[PDB]
Amino acid sequence: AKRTDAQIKSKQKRLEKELEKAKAEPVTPEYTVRFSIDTTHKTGKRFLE
Amino acid sequence: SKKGVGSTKNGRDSEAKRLGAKRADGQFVTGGSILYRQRGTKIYPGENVGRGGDDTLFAKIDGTVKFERFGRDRKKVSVYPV
RNA sequence: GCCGAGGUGGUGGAAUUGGUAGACACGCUACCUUGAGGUGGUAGUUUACGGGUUCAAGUCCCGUCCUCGGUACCA
RNA sequence: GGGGCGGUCGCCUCCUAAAAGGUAACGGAGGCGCCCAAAGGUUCCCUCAGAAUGGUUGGAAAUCAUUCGCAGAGUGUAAAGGCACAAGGGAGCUUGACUGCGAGACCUACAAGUCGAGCAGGGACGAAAGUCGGGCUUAGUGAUCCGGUGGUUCCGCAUGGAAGGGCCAUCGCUCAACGGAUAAAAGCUACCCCGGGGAUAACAGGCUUAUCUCCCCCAAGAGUCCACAUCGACGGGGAGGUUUGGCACCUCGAUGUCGGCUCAUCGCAUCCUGGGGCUGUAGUCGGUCCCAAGGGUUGGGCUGUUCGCCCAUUAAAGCGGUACGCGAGCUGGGUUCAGAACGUCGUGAGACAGUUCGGUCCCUAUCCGUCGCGGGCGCAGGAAAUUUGAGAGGAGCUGUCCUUAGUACGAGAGGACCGGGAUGGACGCACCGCUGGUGUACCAGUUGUUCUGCCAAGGGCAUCGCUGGGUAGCUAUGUGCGGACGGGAUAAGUGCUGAAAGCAUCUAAGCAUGAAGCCCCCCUCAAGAUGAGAUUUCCCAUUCCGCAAGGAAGUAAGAUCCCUGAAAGAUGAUCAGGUUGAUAGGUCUGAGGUGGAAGUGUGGCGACACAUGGAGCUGACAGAUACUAAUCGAUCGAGGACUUAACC
RNA sequence: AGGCCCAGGCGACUGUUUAGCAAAAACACAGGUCUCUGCGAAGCCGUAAGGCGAAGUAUAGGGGCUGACGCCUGCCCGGUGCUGGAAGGUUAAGAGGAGCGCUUAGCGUAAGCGAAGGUGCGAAUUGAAGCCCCAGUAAACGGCGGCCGUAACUAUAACGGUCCUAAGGUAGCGAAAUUCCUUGUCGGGUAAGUUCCGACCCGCACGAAAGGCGCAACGAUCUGGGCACUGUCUCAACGAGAGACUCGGUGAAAUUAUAGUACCUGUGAAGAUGCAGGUUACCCGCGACAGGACGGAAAGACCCCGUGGAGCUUUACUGCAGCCU
RNA sequence: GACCGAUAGUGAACCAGUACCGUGAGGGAAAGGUGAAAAGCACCCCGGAAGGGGAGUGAAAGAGAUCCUGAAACCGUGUGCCUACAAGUAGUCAGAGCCCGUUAACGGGUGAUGGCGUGCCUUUUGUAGAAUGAACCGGCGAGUUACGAUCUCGUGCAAGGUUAAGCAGAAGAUGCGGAGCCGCAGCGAAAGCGAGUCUGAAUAGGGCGCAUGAGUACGUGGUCGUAGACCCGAAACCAGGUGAUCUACCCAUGUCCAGGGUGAAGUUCAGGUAACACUGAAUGGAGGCCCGAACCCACGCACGUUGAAAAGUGCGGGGAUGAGGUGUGGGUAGGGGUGAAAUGCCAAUCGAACCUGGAGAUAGCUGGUUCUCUCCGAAAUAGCUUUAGGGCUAGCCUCAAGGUAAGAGUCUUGGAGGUAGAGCACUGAUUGGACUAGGGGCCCCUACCGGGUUACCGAAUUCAGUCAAACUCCGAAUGCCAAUGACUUAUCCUUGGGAGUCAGACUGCGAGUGAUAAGAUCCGUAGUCGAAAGGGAAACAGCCCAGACCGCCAGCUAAGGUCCCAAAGUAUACGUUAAGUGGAAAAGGAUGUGGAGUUGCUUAGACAACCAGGAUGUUGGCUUAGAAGCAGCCACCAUUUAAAGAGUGCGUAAUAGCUCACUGGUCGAGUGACUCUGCGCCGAAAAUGUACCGGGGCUAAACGUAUCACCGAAGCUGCGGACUGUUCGAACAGUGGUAGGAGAGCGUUCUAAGGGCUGUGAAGCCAGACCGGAAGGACUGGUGGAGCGCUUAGAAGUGAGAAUGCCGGUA
Ligand SMILES: CC[C@H]1OC(=O)[C@@H](C)C(=O)[C@H](C)[C@@H](O[C@@H]2O[C@H](C)C[C@H](N(C)C)[C@H]2O)[C@](C)(OC)C[C@@H](C)C(=O)[C@H](C)[C@H]2N(CCCCn3cnc(-c4cccnc4)c3)C(=O)O[C@]12C
Q1: Is B75 within a domain?
Q2: Beta bridge partners of B44
Q3: From A28, B18, B21, B33, which residue has the greatest number of CB atoms within 10 Å?
Q4: How many Å does it take to go from CA A4 to C1' D333?
Q5: Rounded to whole angstroms, how far apart are CA atoms B77 and B56?
Q6: How far is the CA of B34 from the centre of ligand 1 (A)?
Q7: Does residue A41 lie within 7 Å of nucleic acid chain E, judged by its CB?
Q8: What is the tally of structural domains in chain B?
């Protein structure tokens, strides 16, 4: 159990050291708006003369 | 057999701070000397005793110390001269 | 009992607090086409729960319930 | 409370904390690594939460008045302490969230940390008094070193500068393992090595007994009725120290581990056998309980296995202690050494949360202890025999079949206690006549080669050359025997008489039965039984010293040295003998064993057969026999203390 | 001067191997394949000369892997390696020198400015390989999924849906040297078989060159059965020789505080010969036996500790040789 | 020469870098003494010699060739005393008997017998330890030196102390040499200023100073620092060499392989065809082919396992013509070679050879660390620590100088603090009743609208009760802080030198963790041990008593005891128990007894026992063929009667048959429930053996109450010594001790001035019945045969019982 639990910490120290050397951030997302519209009113025919 | 449960969660404790009487009744006491370390005002300042910023009761003048009472149920330090 | 994981529509399931009964693929319903089915075309149905935080909650937080698995009594 | 894992590492508050202060544990709870330009300062104001009513949409509960509410509210934030003269709420004005300090204190190993009246300079608010060096107190943070920034009547390697340094103010550290080893760091080791510890783990011992095993109380209920035939819930009380554990007290200058083998012994909580009481015990069989540890308690298949299941017996195939008895007694299959492989994990060396094949079990016994055998002396003379028994050891088990008797019982099916008899199993003791074994100086056959000069007859060697028999001795698988009959006292139990207590009662008195158990009977050892015993019998009380006690020195009866030896034996010992003698060897007769000797003759060409001829040979066997050796010797070995009593 | 037969696992075999615990299923092997290398080859030894390779020349020579033979060797190039490309981004030192300090003649009544020079620093620009990027390669390193519904119901799913992935384990094999559950279940062998054999297949946790499946022969290999055979055992007995034992000669050694060295129960550093209370025991040897002297031996090999060591590993840290540029 | 003297000093006093050991590099000993001189034993005897006894020589022959002296271990001979029914850490104390007759004194050797008694060392909380170390004896073997720092003590000079190198001088002292160093003046980072000075704006405040002034040069001593720094000990690392005579592979070059089988390719012949294929004979001789000797290798067993042998023997086993065995010559060398790969092999070494150097690596770890007495005497704790078995500071100990009577106890008095207890007034928990908005459920209709009910739950109110470490309206006993006086004892404070200790244990109490288990763990508190002997608890660190300077053949006591082991009461008085309770344990069970308290029956008459009653309404009706209760309901009813339930027992498959109930007669006075408590009973089992009194054994020799004696310690007292401290020869007080601090000495070797004793016999050695408080010191006698003590100083290679120490001798 001690032999397995010494590996279980060695791999975590390797993990944290490679993550401090890596420092590769998640990529910031591109920009979207979604924005859209409705204007769904029942409307007549004639507007501008 | 040794089955594992851990995690006490309650190890820590703060350092003992020495509240309470530092000088006694009828004690000769110089100026500026701390008469009572407390939190809150368990005991009030009376004559010639000031309450500090950490509400310790200290003596403003030289003289003996008296712990009288503030009447109903309440105490008081007062320093008198000789 | 303890630890770790997930609880969405009939289904499998994405969603870094910012609009989802559902946005995505199926089912499902009503119609059309066809002799009648199938395919195809048109339209349609509160996030396990309860209480907050917030202008805004599936998400952030505190508790309850369920299911997967590891870890036990026993056969 | 071994190490790893988990958890923690610094600071604050409460409880532990034992009415000062302090105080630990991997004790119980919580928080912190900040926030606020007002949530600071001052001045002036003023009082909270809830409840009961009146009130739209307003809801149980917003806001309103209204009474009652010295306190739950509020206090930026955990928790404690504190607060309504506000520290809690408003509004104005403000920057003291100042600079240089600081008498004196608390705290503390240090480093640090906390409080501080007052002084001066400049202010804020206030009419003034005054208050203000942050907040309601305690958390909200880290040394130094090295660098940055700002400022300075500081220094500046000859001089003037400068580079650079100092000082002051300050910034960069989750250096979070928070008094911070570096600016910078993860693993394998079964290929391993060293220095230490029983300061520290496992085994076994010890304390404990939660757990385990066992026992019991209460009694609801089950048991057709009926708690107590047998069961016994919910709960309760204990014993034991065999389980899994707790703790680390002995051992790390070594306390070898499981299973098996050999050998046991002990406890009784009894598996069989013995005796019993209760029954929901008709009988055979049973169930439970009490007494009893005397004896016994199997052989196989698989597994390393203990365990377990199975097969087939048994009267039964008991549970536990002894370092899970027993490795200076044995085995080494399993597990945990080095090789190697599979599955799986790891990037990896390697590892196991697994499996598989192979793998050095050392020691001449000093003491105690066991089992045997001797040698000395004792035992008030010296000797030879036979002994009593204190004491001690052994043995102590039991089947089946028949008779009683198909009787008792039962409706039947089924089927007895008790009382007799035979024959067994295991075990034990003896012995070899029988059956067998072994028999290496017995007898025979035969091969190879070699020797006796040759044929014939023999010898050597080849495991005793091999092979077929085999005497004595030793021996079991063979034979003979035994554990039987009984007393006496009991245990459980069953009772008589019988009160205390006009009765009842196995009771205190008085008596009696009653078990494989206890003491005997049976077998062995046994007077070192220093408590040294008792019988019957032999020898007798001599010689010098010396003045005695006493010494020594010839003996008696008796024994030994030495010798022939076996019925005995490691050696001693025992025993049979030592010339008036069969103790051994030889001899000669025999038994037994082997089997038809050699020579000769005949028959056959010959291998060979047959006769002479139950022949010849013959180790340990037994009966005669003085043939040979037990020769002559020599040594040791009594002279019997004292007192008293009794006798004559 | 052979024991033999029946079946199985692994390895084709003959060989080799831990001298002194492991002889093997481990190495090696013929075979297969991948890759390097145009010959001053590649790789290797050496700082270099000089060599090996090799007086060899791709049918040759190094290196990895797998191991005769038979049938075969599936999917994934997303990650890591190689291999190729390289337009572009980055990227060193060296180059370049815009400028800013510092000093200073001089100008300035002060304050300050200040040429040239020296000197300290230094921006833009250029600057390879590598890396980022784009493709190929799995007999390279490696990896090879879930869930839901659906058939005369009693069950499963040929089928369909949908997430996820780089792809979701194909053939063949499967309680195996791999199966924890476990002594799976069924069948055989056996009176009885946790092992064995043949099946099944919910494969904890097989699987195709860490090769998959078979396979005649071979094997001081491992495993199960059987014939013959036997003191291996029921259950021991006897005989022979060498020691042991007695006598004559010779004569060590480990060990060892001094020892006139009992056994119960107890106590005690918790397991006494030595202590306590009892119980027993004349003095001295000889052959035996090994229960104790926590016996002898080896300053525990297990466990922890030491801010001990040493071999190994890697995407631990920091370096170095080599190799590109 | 204040160096060595044969285990020392070179490794080597001697034919020594020798003998040995290794292939090699390299490692590396042991071992001195006749005499003044050979005068080294002519001669005789035993003896084969060896070796002797005489005789000679000699001063000595005990001086005779490993030879001066010649210890101890060890081994022998003779005898004085003891010893063959007694277990004895081996002694000591008592003690007869015997045998002697000394350094002549409360002699000496032995000791039957009695009481007591589990070695030394180290490490430990604790060791007889079944933990370690040593077989014994002997020698050797560990805190030293240099330079520097500081403190005490000493001396000189002192606000001035003093030179170093050097020169001269017998390896000297001394003279010269003041260059230098430390001080006299501090403060500040520095400029600087100066009895002041920095900070500061400050004439302020504070820090550090001096006004209350001693240093300096040497010397002894303590300690620290740098050196191997107190001895011994690693595994390891590095540098340069030496090794393929073993073994791995390779290179050149030879050589070995008895015999027997199987029988490939090919070839030939015959058949066969169109020719081939093909078939069959023969021939041939292949083969990491087979069986099997030599040889090689090692798998199985048994033996050996202080071996025949540091890897073998015996019996079997594999290969045994090719990846073969093997000889000879040769090559590769350590961070390297070699490897059909095991990290295997590289000279009986291998996860990195051996040797020599760095090197006396380092070791926070283990072991040891040697003479004595006296005064005093700890700690096992806090904080911090890559720290946890280590270290530093503080606490605790010691010495000195100081200040000096501050300390300490108790009484009186004043305070702070909120536990134990208690209480509910907060905060939580929580039992029941009363009401009680409301939530359901039965529903009625009906716009869930209105309701109608329930003993179905109830938020909030009230009364009454409980409980709390993190609850307090309250609040102790103590402990704590003081002042004040009062007594009563001295021990605090400061400064400096030196430490050690940071593993603690158990018991009583207050808590925690644990299971309100543990000889458990962790704190507070007090004791004891540690570091404490003596007496008791049988034995027993830690429990109870009490603290050891020493002697005594003296007394009184503590705890514990008084029948015998075994000292003291078979003591007294009054009760209890009878189980061996005492001398082991619970729930629970029980007519065991002793003592207190009430109550009912109660001579117009109980209890026990004897006799007769065993009913009436009504023989009780259903689920039922029954139940006169009786397998179970329904009334718990009511008079015949002095007295009877329609039922508590028994029984049947149920009634049946009965018994008690309940009252009468006979009898003739204690009887029949309950509570408290004292002492007992069962409940009650385990492992070699009585085995839970120590034993015998006890019925008081147990227990309870009470009283008086006595025993009982190293306590106290008496007497007599010794030492230390206090007051000025006496008084008073004291004196266990680990680590450790301090003080006084003893001894060894050498040197120095003195002194003198030794050939009429030095040191050494061997004996003694001598002296001193110890270490130790003489005096005789005997061996020895030439050096050695005493007094005062000095300097140390300074004292051994322990290192699994080294060497030697011997068990
Ligand atoms: C032959 C007997 C050997 O014993 C055993 O090895 C073994 C039987 C043991 O059981 C023995 C008693 C062990 O004790 C045990 O140790 C354990 C670690 C602990 C045990 N207890 C403490 C629990 C303890 O009993 C131990 C440790 O031995 C290892 C004792 C220790 C002192 C020894 O090592 C010991 C000296 C062994 N040895 C070492 C060489 C071994 C290599 N080798 C093998 N063969 C040869 C050989 C052959 C032929 C020729 N040459 C050489 C050489 C020998 O030469 O002989 C030995 C004594």
Answers
A1: yes
A2: B76
A3: B21
A4: 31
A5: 11
A6: 78
A7: no
A8: 1
